[PDB]
From a paper:
The membrane-anchored SNARE (soluble N-ethylmaleimide-sensitive factor acceptor protein receptor) proteins provide the energy to drive membrane fusion in various cellular contexts, such as intracellular trafficking and exocytosis. Supercomplexes of NSF, α-SNAP, and either a syntaxin tetramer or one of two binary complexes of syntaxin—SNAP-25 reveal atomic details of SNARE processing and show how sequential ATP hydrolysis drives disassembly. NSF comprises three structured domains connected by flexible linkers—the adapter N-domain followed by the D1 and D2 AAA+ domains. Six NSF protomers come together to form the active form of the enzyme, a homo-hexamer.
To gain insight into the structural nature of binary complex formation and disassembly by NSF, we prepared a complex of NSF, ɑ-SNAP, and the binary t-SNARE complex (21bin20S) composed of full-length soluble SNAP-25 and soluble syntaxin-1a (1–267) in the absence of divalent cation (i.e., non-hydrolyzing conditions) and performed single-particle cryo-EM. Classes with evidence of NSF D1 domains engaging ordered ɑ-SNAP—SNARE sub-complexes were carried forward; eight 21bin20S models were built into reconstructions ranging from 3.39–4.01 Å in resolution, differing mainly in the orientation of N domains and a sub-complex of three ɑ-SNAP molecules and four SNARE motifs relative to the D1 ATPase ring. All classes revealed substrate-bound NSF without Mg2+ needed for ATP hydrolysis and disassembly, and share the same overall architecture, with a spire composed of NSF N-domains and the ɑ-SNAP—SNARE subcomplex on top, the NSF D1 ring in the middle tier, and the NSF D2 ring forming the bottom tier. A Hexameric NSF engages the ɑ-SNAP—2:1 binary SNARE subcomplex via multiple N-domains (salmon), which engage three ɑ-SNAP molecules (gold) surrounding the 2:1 binary SNARE complex composed of two syntaxin H3 domains (dark red) and the SN1 and SN2 SNARE domains of a single SNAP-25 molecule (green). A linker N-terminal to one of the syntaxin H3 domains is found within the catalytic D1 ring of NSF (light blue). Of the eight 21bin20S classes with the 2:1 binary SNARE complex from the dataset collected under non-hydrolyzing conditions, six engage syntaxin and two engage SNAP-25 within the pore of the D1 ring. Docking the 2:1 binary complex structure back into the seven individual 21bin20S reconstructions reveals an apparent preference for syntaxin, with six of eight reconstructions featuring the N-terminus of syntaxin H3 bound within the pore of the D1 ring. Taken together, we observe that the NSF D1 ring can bind to at least two different SNAREs, syntaxin, and SNAP-25, in various configurations. Otherwise, the classes are nearly identical; protomers B–E D1 domains also bind ATP, while protomer A, at the bottom of the D1 split, is ADP-bound in both cases.
Author numbering:
A (entry chain C): 212 to 740
B (entry chain B): 212 to 638
C (entry chain A): 203 to 318
D (entry chain I): 1 to 40
The structure:
Amino acid sequence: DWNFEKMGIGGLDKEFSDIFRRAFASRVFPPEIVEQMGCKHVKGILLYGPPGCGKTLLARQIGKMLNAREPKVVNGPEILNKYVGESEANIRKLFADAEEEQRRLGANSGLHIIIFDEIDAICKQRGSMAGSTGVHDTVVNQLLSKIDGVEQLNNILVIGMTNRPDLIDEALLRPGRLEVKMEIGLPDEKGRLQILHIHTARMRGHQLLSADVDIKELAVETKNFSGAELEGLVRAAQSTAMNRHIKASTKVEVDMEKAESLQVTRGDFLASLENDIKPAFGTNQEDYASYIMNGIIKWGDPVTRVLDDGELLVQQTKNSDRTPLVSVLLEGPPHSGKTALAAKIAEESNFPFIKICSPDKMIGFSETAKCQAMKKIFDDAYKSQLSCVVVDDIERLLDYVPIGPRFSNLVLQALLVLLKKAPPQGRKLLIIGTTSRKDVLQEMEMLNAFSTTIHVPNIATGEQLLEALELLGNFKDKERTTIAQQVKGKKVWIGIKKLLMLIEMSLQMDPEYRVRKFLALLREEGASP
Amino acid sequence: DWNFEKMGIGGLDKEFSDIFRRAFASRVFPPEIVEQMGCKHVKGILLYGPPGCGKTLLARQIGKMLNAREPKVVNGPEILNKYVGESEANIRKLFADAEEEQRRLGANSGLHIIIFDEIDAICKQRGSMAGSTGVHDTVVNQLLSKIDGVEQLNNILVIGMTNRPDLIDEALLRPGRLEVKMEIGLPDEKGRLQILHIHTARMRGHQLLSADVDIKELAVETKNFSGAELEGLVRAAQSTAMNRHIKASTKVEVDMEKAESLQVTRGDFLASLENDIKPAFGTNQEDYASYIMNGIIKWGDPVTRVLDDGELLVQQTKNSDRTPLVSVLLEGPPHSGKTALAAKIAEESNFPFIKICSPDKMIGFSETAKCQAMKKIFDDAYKSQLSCVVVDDIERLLDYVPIGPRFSNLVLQALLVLLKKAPPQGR
Amino acid sequence: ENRQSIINPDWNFEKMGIGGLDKEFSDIFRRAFASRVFPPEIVEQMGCKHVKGILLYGPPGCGKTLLARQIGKMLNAREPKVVNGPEILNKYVGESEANIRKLFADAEEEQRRLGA
Amino acid sequence: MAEDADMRNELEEMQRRADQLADESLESTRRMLQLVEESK
Ligand SMILES: Nc1ncnc2c1ncn2[C@@H]1O[C@H](COP(=O)(O)OP(=O)(O)OP(=O)(O)O)[C@@H](O)[C@H]1O
Ligand SMILES: Nc1ncnc2c1ncn2[C@@H]1O[C@H](COP(=O)(O)OP(=O)(O)OP(=O)(O)O)[C@@H](O)[C@H]1O
Ligand SMILES: Nc1ncnc2c1ncn2[C@@H]1O[C@H](COP(=O)(O)OP(=O)(O)OP(=O)(O)O)[C@@H](O)[C@H]1O
Ligand SMILES: Nc1ncnc2c1ncn2[C@@H]1O[C@H](COP(=O)(O)OP(=O)(O)OP(=O)(O)O)[C@@H](O)[C@H]1O
Ligand SMILES: Nc1ncnc2c1ncn2[C@@H]1O[C@H](COP(=O)(O)OP(=O)(O)O)[C@@H](O)[C@H]1O
């Protein structure tokens, strides 16, 4: 009475199809032909992937699908003991019921499933430098000699799950021992829709779910959510809708009059999305609120030009096929506002994965740690169909100082190598970078890597300054006229950030001296290229 | 017999309301409706914050609010053992009863509670090879496999407490494991008032508290106090009041005439508030007597200008929204009296968190230690609605020497990065 | 049964054998142990815990241990458990904590057997 | 510092004390006494 709709797995059609074909295709064809072919049976499966994507569920459902014995289970390092030669006595007792039904019943036995777990804790590689430990290097040898040894078993099946497939011993993954290897990854829109249907069917069954909740919008609005977080979202919404009827002021009592009209509405879903769940391979509005502090105001024409260039680069990296990697550099004089524009260009991209590598989280780090952190950000970025990464304030990332000069040469060489590494076949990536000293970057031969360049100027005319003042709306008509008469016949050179600081500084005198103080401050802050 | 007014907690209405909503909401609704939804129950909680703000109290009060059997406890790293394969046995020994009862009874079993403690001492991130690859990557895998494995449990609840929420592993904090994360922080005025009203209830009932003491003029004079220090203040006042009756030096002797007329008066609170308890996120009066050693004599006009400019800079950082972070540099010829004026400007601002980072407390340190010390002070400065940090004698921090030149680059980079980092929202 | 007899039947200060400290002892007595001699009725009515330890610092050789032992012999307490700092550390995993965890055993046991 | 990897253990048993034969001897002796009493 097995049926795929019963298992309750969504978003993993291809993986299961491949597993079924490879492993269970030779145990269902008529025996005579399978004998004529003269082929043995596969006896291994390995599953790996990032946390929370449906590995243990798959193993459990495979366990429940077979007409066989009750599968064993080994919860991590559960086969260790402190005596000599006891850590291997528990490794021989697992294969001790399958070796008895092969001698007696011959070739009519039944599958004996075994399910390891966190296999990377007792199956790490053996060293050839004579640096063994004992906890392994005698367990691994016994396991290897028991899965495939001098005498042959043909009625077993072994399943393994792990998060770090690098460390597993190599002699244990040849086509004789663990032949099938699968990676379980994040789903796309269809997978999320299927998961939401699977997790909402029961509620919908008993007219408990409201009529104005639509699942397609939620599927669209949850980007790069893993398998577990959708379940958590649904559970949080249910918990809120259930708590709406409980009073915990003095004693906890349930209102039975209103408890019959229980219903879950999309307001609960929106509140849960806003407050409770926070994904890992997505983005949250905190970053754009911490970097774009005071929004963006169009004080002139150049802003639109910069944004348009960003748009063109985004579209190119999204549609092309020859160039799956493009990068650009934003540069200009200091205090001109060139880190808000990069964040805005990235935010308007509408890519699924967005990150900001900034040297605010690396105070006190030695260069090794900086290299490793950058590598772990890029490695995380190599697991999505579209991405965007921002490298911020390069000059502070190399530890530069005009005297000497002095800097780090082990971090400048993990950047020149990481700007020319194409991602795994079939994906795209866009890298943006901001700096304030182009010439120094030009002496290090770092402008060859970047594909193009964009320029960000300062306010350079009285009309632009008055437009910015009107946009901010600080000084009123008479003060604006006075400032116009006092500044329209000159030239100005000042960044926007300094303008905000100067306005805030000058808003502290008494109401009859603010304009004079502002003009006095602005006069000293005057320079030229 | 449980009602919130007797739990003995104050200043944590929102935290407890949210914890109750998320963790215990679905265990008290009628079973029929819950079964007509098919939902599991949340399996963990995490509490973190500065020292002494009410974490263990909350855990202890939760442990005895439920009708479960008595909770287990793990007093830090008490699961470690030297022999191979003996730590994981102690880890496996905790979930046994829950497994047995789940297997036998079914969907009628009662709750089983496990209360970890100082969880950061045994659960650090895996993969930090060459640091920990034995008895610290096989004591985390076992826990991961036991909390949520191939066998299903539905009758456990786990609680963890830690001062450093950055070290803990990542695969141990996803929906399906420890997933309700709260933060316990310093209280605002109402919190202090509630704590004081909680901690002086018995005394007022028996008429041992004078009618002179006011608990609304005492919540205004204690800024950036935490709960532990308010408790200690009350206890110090009680001790000072008690000892005032014992009149004996050679051999302990107890009077009885005035022992009946025992009372606590405002004088005791004033005497203990300024002489016994010293907060950790507050001002200190000794520094402004060790730096301003001979006062500020006014020898002309140039001395009444720096102070006015300091006043203007102080007033700007208090009534602004587009400039939460300010800075200023005082410079001049040597032997000109710079540190005294900075100390005076800091003193005359009335901020509730003033600290000085001087280089005579770092004699003999290396570069990394200096970085860590400055970072620690600044980190402490981010948990207070207002602050003022003084950084004097920069060239000594950098270790400048004209020959060469020679100095420290790492400290310079840390200092140049800490001068334009904004605090959390609203501070 | 009132536990007001924590004070040893007979005690003088100067006779203890300590000379040179007269404000340290006064402040310690006031701030720490003023609640171990008052009759239990009032202490119970006011509902206050007791101080759970103190710290002593100074040069080496000025008589710190003597004062600790005298404090202990004042309150009819049991025999103190003298320990040394660098004598607790050990090289195997789980030994230093075992040494540190073996000092609070008798207190817990006697708390179990006779509460309060 | 250098943390010791851990440790491993070895065992050496000792002879057991069944002390069960004496029970049979005592039962037999009691039967001796019964028969001896009857004969008289
Ligand atoms: N495709 C899916 N369909 C439905 N539920 C899913 C799916 N993938 C994951 N889940 C949810 O994940 C929960 C448990 O996840 P699972 O056991 O697969 O985690 P894991 O990633 O293998 O574990 P870990 O990261 O802790 O090593 C399941 O109860 C189910 O709710
Ligand atoms: N049109 C604008 N362009 C850029 N920033 C703007 C604009 N209007 C307002 N701002 C605000 O001005 C500030 C720009 O400062 P920003 O953080 O970009 O400095 P920066 O160029 O990185 O300087 P630094 O030289 O210190 O590294 C931000 O608060 C941004 O919100
Ligand atoms: N919010 C509060 N309400 C009432 N009493 C409090 C509160 N916070 C602290 N206290 C009192 O102060 C004591 C502080 O001890 P507590 O167990 O809360 O410390 P903690 O935060 O776990 O400390 P740490 O983790 O730094 O060791 C509490 O036992 C209680 O006596
Ligand atoms: N008007 C004043 N302004 C500043 N300090 C004064 C004034 N009148 C007296 N003093 C005293 O003079 C001393 C000021 O010296 P200070 O400690 O500031 O030296 P400094 O400038 O840091 O020295 P150096 O550069 O040599 O390290 C303090 O004792 C201060 O009390
Ligand atoms: N205040 C004091 N009065 C009399 N003797 C003292 C005093 N302080 C120290 N001593 C002498 O010092 C000795 C003990 O010193 P000790 O307590 O070991 O110093 P520390 O605590 O610094 O190690 C005793 O023999 C005692 O006679």
